[PDB]
């Protein structure tokens, strides 16, 4: 109910551009890269 009270005074919240699934996808990609390639994928090809 507090959100509606704030909204009726002109105060609102904008959503982020990246969703939580996308951030989890980044984390999974980083984890897979480090597990299968070590540190080679951070300097060039994996």
């Amino acid at each position: 109910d507090l959100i509606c009270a704030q909204k009726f005074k002109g105060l609102t919240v904008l959503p982020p551009l990246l969703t939580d699934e996308m951030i989890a996808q980044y984390t999974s990609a980083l984890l897979a890269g480090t597990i299968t390639s070590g540190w080679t994928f951070g300097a060039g090809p994996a």
Partner: protein, 50 residues
């Protein structure tokens, strides 16, 4: 364990709350509601409250 992140969230909430609570202050005027000021005073002397 996750206090730091929670702190961030809490801070933002607090700020918003404070801002809303500032709408009940009259800052030395006769009332906190603009409609009352306009419906009780003639415009030459109603400008100071607004």
């Amino acid at each position: 364990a996750l206090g730091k992140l929670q702190d961030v969230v809490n801070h933002n909430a607090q700020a918003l709350n404070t801002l809303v609570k500032q709408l009940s202050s009259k800052f030395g005027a006769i009332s906190s509601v603009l409609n009352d000021i306009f419906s009780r005073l003639d415009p030459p002397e109603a400008e100071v409250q607004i």
